[PDB]
Amino acid sequence: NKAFLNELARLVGSSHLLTDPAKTARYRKGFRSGQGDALAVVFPGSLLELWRVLKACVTADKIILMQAANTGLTEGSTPNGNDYDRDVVIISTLRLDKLHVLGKGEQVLAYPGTTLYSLEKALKPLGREPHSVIGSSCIGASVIGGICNNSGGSLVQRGPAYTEMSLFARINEDGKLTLVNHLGIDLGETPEQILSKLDDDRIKDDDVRHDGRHAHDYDYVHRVRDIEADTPARYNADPDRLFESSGCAGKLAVFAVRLDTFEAEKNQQVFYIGTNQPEVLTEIRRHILANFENLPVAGEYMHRDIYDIAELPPRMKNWRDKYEHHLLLKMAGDGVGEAKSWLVDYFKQAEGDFFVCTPEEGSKAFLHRFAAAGAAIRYQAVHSDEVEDILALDIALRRNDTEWYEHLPPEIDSQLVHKLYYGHFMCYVFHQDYIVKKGVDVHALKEQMLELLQQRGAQYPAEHNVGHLYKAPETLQKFYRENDPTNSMNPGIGKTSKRKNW
């Protein structure tokens, strides 16, 4: 072991290797939960260094945990406990932060540390927008980390993060580390050639091939509008979005992804909708999905309790006081006039009301909605020895569900101090965080709640992935194994075996 570590320090430099528990704690603890021991955290500075570190880990038979930023919410980006059969090496990819724009910006090559934030910035002067907008973009979520988790932001027209074109390393059945270039870009024959070409930014449009594979989720547009389908719009175990790097959850080492970007959206307007009747929001969604020509850009839901705890903008304060259910509907281009006209008519009849945001209201509303997650976490710490731990569920309802707002069995409802509800309303993806009464068996509660969701036909992790909080369905387990036959990369994800060879 003294030798393996010296090799790492030789490959990335001693200032880019951490072994002291007190120093690695920063990378061993999950954003909301999850924690474990790790032998080392290494920070390669080039893709070629990443390759050599992976090779050194495979030859020392270590477990590899790829990490970018670590905003994963279900403990799947940090070690889970200490019972691994081999030492764990966390490879932080955050220094690999270059970005390569292809052509006029219609596609990009993102590297392991490229942040969504930097992607947004580089595309803006090109008149393009990224494929994803998630609550964690403001705190540095990475592009590749979202592809690995099939992340789903607030962007209603884009689907969960997805691409069939990527460059990644895979430990095969024989335990051999292999580099697989499925980027559809000619980069060379050896790892040195391929990775240097990319590290030196010597890729030009001439190296690029155009072949029909998809660099985003095609037709989510269609799937999201099908309000008569009896399955959800998107969920982590959805087999059609599990492709190589897409949904890999750390089971491969993703070096690069080729992704589609989109034309920037014209003139956006946020419509702040509030109501006390769940059915009024249900019909806004159903009518827009079935009848609008223009899909919204975003449609974020916030219940009042989560509103208060997340908590200023006076009109929002007014809406909070008047309405329990809020829908932040962002339209763009023509959808603005379409939404404004239909809402004016709809609310002359339907119970609540709405207003057209001022740039300041609109940004503060979204900033408030995001942060919902951090909220519950902080309410917990405040009331630590008085409430159990936070029970957080991530769910995707059947597209034709007529009752999205849950009415739990009275005996389950009574065990909750608070019920925090927020989500991506148009996609029927909801995050439900509960503050549970002191003395309640949280594990038993969760099990009861998961049974009710199965009964409702919902799927669960929707966007956050299974991590170590959810059991991976058969589709996922089979995918994880195909990618990592030796089970040497982020091992027990989805409550699966943590041991070598599974």
Ligand X SMILES: Cc1cc2nc3c(=O)[nH]c(=O)nc-3n(C[C@H](O)[C@H](O)[C@H](O)COP(=O)(O)OP(=O)(O)OC[C@H]3O[C@@H](n4cnc5c(N)ncnc54)[C@H](O)[C@@H]3O)c2cc1C
d(CA 331, CA 321): 25
Q: Which is nearer to ligand X, 148 or 440 (CB)?
A: 148
CA atoms within 13 A on the CB side of 189: 0
Q: Which is nearer to ligand X, 390 or 440 (CB)?
A: 390
Relative orientation angle of helices 2-12 and 47-59, to the nearest 10 degrees = 170
CB-CB contact of 128 with 179 (8 Å) = no
d(CA 97, CA 60): 27
CB-CB contact of 494 with 472 (8 Å) = yes
Q: Is 382 annotated as a binding residue?
A: no
* Residue span 33-72 as binding mask against ligand X, x where in contact by CB under 6 A, dash where not: --------------------------------xxxxxxxx
Q: Is 146 annotated as a binding residue?
A: no
CA atoms within 13 A on the CB side of 423: 24
Residues whose CB is less than 8 angstroms from the CB of residue 190 and which lie 6 or more positions away in sequence, other chains included: none
Say whether residue 145 binds ligand X (CB under 6 A). yes
Residue 501: other Cβ atoms inside 10 A: 11
Say whether residue 79 binds ligand X (CB under 6 A). no
Q: Is 132 annotated as a binding residue?
A: no
Say whether residue 242 binds ligand X (CB under 6 A). no
Q: Is 68 annotated as a binding residue?
A: yes
Say whether residue 459 binds ligand X (CB under 6 A). no
Indicate which single residue of 203, 253, 270, 387 sits in contact with ligand X (rule: CB under 6 A): 253
Q: Is 88 annotated as a binding residue?
A: no
Q: Which is nearer to ligand X, 181 or 415 (CB)?
A: 181
Say whether residue 90 binds ligand X (CB under 6 A). no
Q: Which stretch binds ligand X (CB under 6 A): 20-28, 101-109, 244-252, 449-457?
A: 244-252
Look at phi and psi of residue 296 and say left if phi exceeds 0, alpha if psi is from -120 to 50, else beta: beta
CB of 71 to ligand X, least distance (A): 3
Residue 287: other Cβ atoms inside 10 A: 13
Q: Which is nearer to ligand X, 157 or 277 (CB)?
A: 157
Indicate which single residue of 134, 156, 289, 426 sits in contact with ligand X (rule: CB under 6 A): 134
Indicate which single residue of 250, 296, 299, 352 sits in contact with ligand X (rule: CB under 6 A): 250
Rounded alpha-carbon distances, angstroms, from residue 350 to 197, 267, 281, 342: 59, 27, 10, 12
**370-399 positions binding ligand X, by CB under 6 A:** 373-374
Q: Tell me which residues touch ligand X (CB under 6 A).
A: 31, 65-73, 76-77, 93, 112, 134-136, 141-142, 144-146, 148-149, 151-153, 248-250, 252-254, 373-374, 463-464, 490
